[PDB]
Design a protein around this motif. Sequence first.
Motif: not given
Length: 34
Positions: A28-34
């Motif tokens: 999730e911390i890949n496609k949902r970065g900043r």
Amino acid sequence: MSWALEMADTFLDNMRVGPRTYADVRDEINKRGR
């Protein structure tokens, strides 16, 4: 000592039905970065 309050706080903070796995929540911390 207290009534485990310091723990209750971190609980409601991550009270998302408990954890499930690391590969998922992690991706999730890949496609949902900043």
